[PDB]
Design a protein around this ligand. Structure first.
Ligand SMILES: OC[C@H]1O[C@@H](O[C@H]2[C@H](O)[C@@H](O)[C@@H](O)O[C@@H]2CO)[C@H](O)[C@@H](O)[C@H]1O
Length: 626
């Protein structure tokens, strides 16, 4: 339970306690609600709106559900309650579901699925007999009446958008669709954009972008789609693309990019795709996720939440929040408390305060808690100042022949330099440390010695959540090194390992008893090349892209460098990077070397940025700057 220092919370929508105005046959009554689910928390012009399911009788998905809203004009001290949308009232189990919310001006656009009488889960329905898809538009107006600031919201009659759903898509016959739940966006050209989950007559699930250029009068689907198996998509716009982050049951979450309103989808292999696991071993159901772009203290970042689900199934305990600038991926920490069940969530950033509406579940009775994320916003601002300082400090270095090109920070993701503890080498970017053994701190890095010496920067080793999954598609690992002793055989100095030992490599660099380098390319025959001297430091660059590895000493490729390291159409799964040894006592090499300033970029640096880092190795360390 990390609800941070100075952060606190209330139980806003109290299961079996909070009442709503329930309407039926021309009569409104105050009704105690069983469970509140599917939190959507937004800002309309300074009115904090909280939208959710009111699951009246039971938390069963297929039961009687209206869309409730609660709205506050004082940043969630007091709230007014209403029912935003009501179901058909056609049976005891009629329902409007997966409320998905777009804010635009003083308007709230809410899309829901609607079901009349089925008790089966929607993905199992072989047709659309019980289903409709409805947009209701709520309008917020703002008074300062009788002295104090007041507000209300008038909700419109839902309008069916079923006319806008084609009966065919590529290679399939359509079935039903719903919003991804949570909060959607207005694009920077003004369009309304819902990422939606859709099923076909084969009952497969897959995600699309459903949009409107006309304030919601009419609706299109992007031509493209996600893989099958992708559900509850949640989307934001980042630097002119849509980022569509999807739930994938029993798998790691797939993230996609689309630069043309969803006409073409490319998997975001270089950044965020397959980063987040739905459970420790990613073999459990996943979750709805809050996924938004904000500007905090002048930097555009993204915020993402998803339960860790230690418990497995749909329990979905331990809601975590993540920060990213589409390069570094920082775990802010756990928002929910202890081991409580805590599946959906909605993060709002408003007037430079952070808030989160999330579920808590005990025994299938759900409340939505409203939390003030003050400590979290503090951690975030600190991590961001850190990102800003290192990028600015690296980028103002005057690189030598006054000045050559700046040290590149585009795509720099991790940085091991001057800070280290007794057993860890610290990421200056503060997201992923390397563990160490037999490590002696020297300026801007470590000196390693003896069997099992070295550092380990985890890749797949990060566990359920893998920030460095990009490395499987491209990376550049850079480092200054010095060999202090002539090894007895070939010893490692640096590389990306595919297994836990370091014995099955993707790409690495070793050095041998003959004073030669042994760059290693996958499982290819190793060929010693070049020459070094005990005591001279050297600059080393490993790049991999397009399934091609290359090794540089002092800014210059080794002879025969640029070989195939991925020997077929399967994607590697890198376990970790090893630095200055294997950091394994089972591996019988002894690397006696010093390694300074390890940089990890999410791309193949080009000739010039490699030559700049080389000539700049003495200027980039963190040493002076702490
Ligand atoms: O546990 C509450 C959640 O149930 C999920 O439905 C599961 C169900 O729990 C499981 O026991 C079995 O029947 O499979 C269902 C999926 O087809 C719902 O998906 C989820 O939304 C919660 O209500």
């Amino acid at each position: 339970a990390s609800l941070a220092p100075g952060s606190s919370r209330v139980e806003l929508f109290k299961r079996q306690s909070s009442k709503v105005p329930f309407e039926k046959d021309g009569k409104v009554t105050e009704r105690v609600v069983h469970s509140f689910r599917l939190p959507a928390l937004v800002n309309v012009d300074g009115v904090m709106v909280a939208i959710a399911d009111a699951r009246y009788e039971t938390s069963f998905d297929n039961s009687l559900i209206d869309t409730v809203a609660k709205y506050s004009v004082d940043d969630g001290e007091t709230w007014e309650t209403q029912i935003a949308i009501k179901n058909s009232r056609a049976s005891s189990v009629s329902r409007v579901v997966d409320p998905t919310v777009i804010v635009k001006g003083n308007k709230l656009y809410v899309l829901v699925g609607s079901y009349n009488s089925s008790r089966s889960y929607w993905t199992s329905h072989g047709d659309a007999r019980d289903w409709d898809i409805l947009l209701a538009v709520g309008e917020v107006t703002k008074s300062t009446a009788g002295g104090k600031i007041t507000a209300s919201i008038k909700w419109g009659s839902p309008v069916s958008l079923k006319e806008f759903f084609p009966a065919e898509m590529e290679g399939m016959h359509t079935n039903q669709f719903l919003g991804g739940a949570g909060v959607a966006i207005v694009a920077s050209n003004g369009n309304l954009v819902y990422p939606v989950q859709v099923t076909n007559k084969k009952k497969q699930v897959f995600s699309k972008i459903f949009y409107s250029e006309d304030e919601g009068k009419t609706w299109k689907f992007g031509k493209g789609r996600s893989a099958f198996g992708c559900s509850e998509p949640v989307a934001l716009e980042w630097e002119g693309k849509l980022i569509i982050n999807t739930r994938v049951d029993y798998r790691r979450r797939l993230v996609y990019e689309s630069s043309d309103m969803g006409n073409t989808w490319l998997e975001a292999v270089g950044t965020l795709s397959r980063v987040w696991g739905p459970s420790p071993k990613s073999n459990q159901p996943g979750s709805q996720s809050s996924f938004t772009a904000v500007t905090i203290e002048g930097m555009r970042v993204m915020l993402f939440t998803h339960p860790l689900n230690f418990k497995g199934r749909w329990l979905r305990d331990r809601l975590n929040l993540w920060l990213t600038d589409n390069q570094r991926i920082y775990n802010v920490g756990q928002v929910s408390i202890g081991d409580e069940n805590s599946a959906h969530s909605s993060v709002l950033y408003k007037d430079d305060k952070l808030y989160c509406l999330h579920e808590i579940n005990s025994n299938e009775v759900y409340s939505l808690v409203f939390a003030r994320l003050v400590g979290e916003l503090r951690i975030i601002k600190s991590v961001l100042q850190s990102w800003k300082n290192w990028d600015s400090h690296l980028s103002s270095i005057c690189t030598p022949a006054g000045c050559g090109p700046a040290v590149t920070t585009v795509g720099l993701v991790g940085f091991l330099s001057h800070s280290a503890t007794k057993t860890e080498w610290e990421d200056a970017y503060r997201c992923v440390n390397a563990s160490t053994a037999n490590a002696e701190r020297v300026p801007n890095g470590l000196k390693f010695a003896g069997v099992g010496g070295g550092a380990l920067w985890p890749v797949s080793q990060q566990g359920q959540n893998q920030r460095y999954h990009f490395a499987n598609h491209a990376f550049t690992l850079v480092a200054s090194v010095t060999i202090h002793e002539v090894p007895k055989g070939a010893s490692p100095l640096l590389g990306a390992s595919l297994d836990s030992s370091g014995g099955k490599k993707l790409l690495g660099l070793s050095y041998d008893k003959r004073h030669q380098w042994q760059p290693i390319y996958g499982s290819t025959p190793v060929t010693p090349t070049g020459s070094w001297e005990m005591g001279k430091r050297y600059h080393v660059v490993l790049t991999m892209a397009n399934k091609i590895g290359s090794v540089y000493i002092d800014g210059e490729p080794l002879e025969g460098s640029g070989q195939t390291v991925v020997p077929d159409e399967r994607t590697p799964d890198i376990s970790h990077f090893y630095v200055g040894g294997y950091k394994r006592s089972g591996m019988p090499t002894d690397s006696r070397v010093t390694v300074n300033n390890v940089l990890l970029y999410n791309r193949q640096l080009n000739a010039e940025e490699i030559r700049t880092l080389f000539l700049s190795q003495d200027l980039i360390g963190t040493e002076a700057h702490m």
